[PDB]
Write a protein that binds this ligand. Sequence first.
Ligand code: PC1
Ligand code: SF4
Ligand code: SF4
Ligand code: SF4
Lengths: 318, 55, 176, 145, 357, 155, 70
Amino acid sequence: MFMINILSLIIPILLAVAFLTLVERKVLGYMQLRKGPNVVGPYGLLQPIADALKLVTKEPLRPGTSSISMFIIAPILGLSLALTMWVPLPMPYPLINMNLGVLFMLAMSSLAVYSILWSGWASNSKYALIGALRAVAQTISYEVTLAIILLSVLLMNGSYTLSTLITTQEHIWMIFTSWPLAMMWFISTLAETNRAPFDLTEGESELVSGFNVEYAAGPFAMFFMAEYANIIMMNAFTAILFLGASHDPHTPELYTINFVLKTLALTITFLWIRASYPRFRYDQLMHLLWKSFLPLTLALCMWHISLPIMTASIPPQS
Amino acid sequence: ASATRVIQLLRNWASGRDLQAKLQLRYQEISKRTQPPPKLPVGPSHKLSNNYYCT
Amino acid sequence: TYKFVNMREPSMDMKSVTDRAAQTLLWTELVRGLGMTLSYLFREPATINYPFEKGPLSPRFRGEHALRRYPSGEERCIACKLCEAVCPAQAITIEAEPRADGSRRTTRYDIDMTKCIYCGFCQEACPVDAIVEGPNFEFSTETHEELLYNKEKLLNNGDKWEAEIAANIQADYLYR
Amino acid sequence: MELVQVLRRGLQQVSGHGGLRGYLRVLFRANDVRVGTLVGEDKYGNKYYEDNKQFFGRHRWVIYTTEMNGRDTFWDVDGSMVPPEWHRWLHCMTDDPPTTKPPTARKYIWTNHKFNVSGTPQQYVPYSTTRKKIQEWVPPSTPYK
Amino acid sequence: RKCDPHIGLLHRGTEKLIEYKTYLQALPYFDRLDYVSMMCNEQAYSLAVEKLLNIQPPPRAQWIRVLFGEITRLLNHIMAVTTHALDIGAMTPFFWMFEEREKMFEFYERVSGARMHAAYIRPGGVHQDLPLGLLDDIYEFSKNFSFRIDELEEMLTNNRIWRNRTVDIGVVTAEDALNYGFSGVMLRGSGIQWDLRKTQPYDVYDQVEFDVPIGSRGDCYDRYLCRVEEMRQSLRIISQCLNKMPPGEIKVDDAKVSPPKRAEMKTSMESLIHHFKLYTEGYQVPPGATYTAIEAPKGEFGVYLVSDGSSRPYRCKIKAPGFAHLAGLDKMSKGHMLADVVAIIGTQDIVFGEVDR
Amino acid sequence: RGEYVVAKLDDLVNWARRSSLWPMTFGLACCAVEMMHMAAPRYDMDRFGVVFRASPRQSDVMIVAGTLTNKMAPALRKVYDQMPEPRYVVSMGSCANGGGYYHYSYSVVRGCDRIVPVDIYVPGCPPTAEALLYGILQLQRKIKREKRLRIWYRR
Amino acid sequence: MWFEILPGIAVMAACLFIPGMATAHIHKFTNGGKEKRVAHFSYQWNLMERDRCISGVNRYHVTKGLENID
Ligand SMILES: CCCCCCCCCCCCCCCCCC(=O)OC[C@H](COP(=O)([O-])OCC[N+](C)(C)C)OC(=O)CCCCCCCCCCCCCCCCC
Ligand code: SF4
Ligand code: SF4
Ligand code: SF4
């Protein structure tokens, strides 16, 4: 009966990912005083279908210098890990109840760089290769901050079991206990997914296409769908560690909508953040992390690792 | 500009600055596209006398 | 007179340092950047929908050319030739022969539409304002040839756009 | 309290659009669901509207006819379909709709305004309208001396 | 370490085509010379030509000339900062304030009849008069304009990541900027005290109060504050000029250099002959050479036209503000990252239509 | 029958093609500034499902605008060839259309059509944002009156 | 106005609502009314083997109360 849930999980993400592009384009439009796509169907709702299959029906040129095997592998693994990434989400009852689910989340988040690296190298372009190693060096540099912040956060949870988050974050949002790490976690997310102001990996007027470079209908759509698949979920991870909701077993629907709205509102801010702020330079993008975030990250981890022992409030791992 | 007062407070507070009285785009203050006929003046040398070009 | 734009001494009290320390730590000038973005979202967009609406123009607009004619019906173009001597792209081309009666009307008036710049000079040049620039600006095409105008196409524009430019010049000649 | 009249306008929008079918027609064909006063109607079916409250640019608008000069048009909205007399008021070049002040009567004015004809058999093709030069010779008709 | 560009992607005839046209036919060249600020170019060319003819424009015509000259001054600084925002990553700011540019463009359409390439400033005064109500439209826009530039100001100035990407990122010292041909704002942001508006008050500039925005060290940030302050000062030059419009004329009363009024054209022969000859060969400018520069809203814009005692120019080399300010790029980018180069351009104003003379 | 099937499929494909026309705006001169008035809050360019896109690999219509010199000519053709199928180039302005007022210049190629197969000729100097938007709408209808599947079906 | 955004997020939220709703309901349906008993440790696993063995129908989510014992 089970392939049901996999399909009932996967296809909604693709549909949610696709309509984020609409939501992004329209939000940005109103952000910078515009209307956005509104002529292709009612309020542009059919536009996502218009461009998507368009990005499947336009000719997919293979660059002459490109290595076909890697040029195909990079979108495949970039897309594949994002879909598998959604399986342990503690959304009411998680599909995959991996007791180490948070490690599972980080393990797959450390392989999207290969999708960045190979696609940059496979294109075999000077513009691609400087975009690639720069892009990969940015994202794995934010790995250490990404890993430690969680280690501070779940240290009060009890384990890395994602479903346990709803039990720990029952009476209050966990943001009220780790809000110094809140924006610290949140800001690091845009670094990983490469969204403005941390949008050095695209740079439409600077990197023209960034790590996507010479990608068109076909592999590009996967990358665009992949990049807009990670954005939707880092909300869900944020909306699970941080702000959550009750999970009354009699009405699992109550947890659904409440969780969904938070994962919607946060995605707006992701889209909202890109609107205002300028775009980072690489030196500062690395300077902010290694020098303005790491010392802060280490200190909070010490505080969050001694606080439960100080107050005799260690969490139960079971 | 036409929004309700409550949402006007929202954008007013989010900006902290009076966006209602000095809203960006035009409204019923511009000069009517129909205008009275003009009667442009004459130049500084439109005199029928003592006005030789040599002067 | 002059006015300094950058020089400024930051106050160096504990409250001032805390203010600046908070500003860097708890991002307030950053959030202000977000603060007035929402004010822009919750605002009416200025998006003119097209062709349903139209951005305003003036009775002086310069666009598609259209050679007019007298109220009796006769062509205003006298072959006075002045429009060429002023046409700074040399787009127009006028050559005339004595008509059957004798009144000279140009046997060829071919504004190379992809040559001119819509000066208004040709309008300002004509002593009988034969050549005008109609308010139309939506006359794109797909073949480069259809841009290349001629005497007949000019006359058709004059007969098609006739009421508008007659009204526009009627309400604008006083300024001229 | 401020919410109810806003939704009242939203429901009044369907009332002013002649039912749900009319609402969906304008929402798809025009993508502008707005109720405005009928200022005038030209000789093709183009229905013109005006709303003072709307800001400059949305002050006056038009939903085009479904048919004019042969071209069937329901998803074929174009800007060259506006007749010249209404081209003034619609572009807000003058606050005087043609239905109020009609164009000065002339014999040579086109009775039917034409849309953009490019890309179709009746499009335009340039040509030299001068007569000729260098008139040639002509001999009697039996050849070789 | 080394940064020399290669231009000519928009090199065009300009001066070469000018010699075969008359002065009036040469006016559209300056309108299209730079593709950003149109009216201020005709300010230079008309000023240079009227200088050669020893004909001064009527006082009113100067007042419209300055009014639209500063309206275009408002046009220029808007795109330089907002394109810098587009470069620096802020896409929201250039959409907001640019809607305001549609209002001045609408003003351009009302007066000249064209949306951007007005061809309005002519030798011997402005070509045509303002429509009845254009002054009111300026005030309605100007009333809310500072409100819009504050919206630019808040999010594009104190933004922590805008500040660092504009502070210290490229700087020129005093004598170095002076000796690189930098002029106008480029020196003013580097601390040099100089401005063509006041030191050489061309046109009616000696009757309007404004403050030049001299600044600190002179990095990307320094001239950025200078530019926005220029817009605020340009707003007063508008406001002072808006309530000072005198009841005068638009053209000189010398039909030999100014086309006669159309009403008198079809009635008086002297008008008809003068209109005929002026529209066939134009006025003959007395021989000589003259380099006259005005404060462009980008830099020092001068035309060194030489008159052969004919109805056409002989050579009309331009002092392009973009040209001389592109000359400084090599020293301007000593020791900076590759991603900075676009911002290094952004603090300056390099419109590829104007740099090529 | 089969003819109706391919006609519906032809309708569906061109509906996408006449919707997501991501443009290569390759303007160089004062035709370029007036185009942003078509990417304006006044007239939205994004409202017709089209967004100004970099990376010519993913682009459909190339908006060429501004005067075209000989120096730019080699660079314009190479990017055009890099542009994927389908690709349409819209000549904007008098200069790009036939050379314009910079016609007889020694360093201007008369019109972009001499280098690239122009699909839409938008006249203007500058073409007002409405006028060039009208050309985009004209190109949109051109995609509608396309018979790609019909030709393949009736080959 | 800004409310035209809501239809864009409407099919967002509803579509994003269903994976959580589904993976709960089939979880309810598969596990005989109750939810899928989760074995994070060996205790909760060799537990279910006792229930699966004792049901007689080889289904863990089948309960046998006091009516079962003799
Ligand atoms: C008993 C109490 C124990 C704990 C007490 C802890 C101390 C008190 C609290 C301190 C503040 C919290 C921790 C530090 C946070 C800032 C870290 C840092 O380095 O900041 C300065 C850093 C660096 O600033 P800087 O570089 O100008 O200065 C730092 C010093 N130097 C120059 C030497 C590096 O700047 C930023 O972080 C700016 C923002 C970058 C990201 C851009 C997007 C921002 C989006 C904001 C809106 C959305 C917010 C969402 C919030 C979450 C929602 C769920
Ligand atoms: S259009 Fe006017 S100026 Fe030109 S030749 Fe004819 S009459 Fe003379
Ligand atoms: S308006 Fe056009 S056609 Fe007339 S003279 Fe000027 S450039 Fe030539
Ligand atoms: S066609 Fe006209 S507006 Fe366009 S670049 Fe050439 S001169 Fe400028």
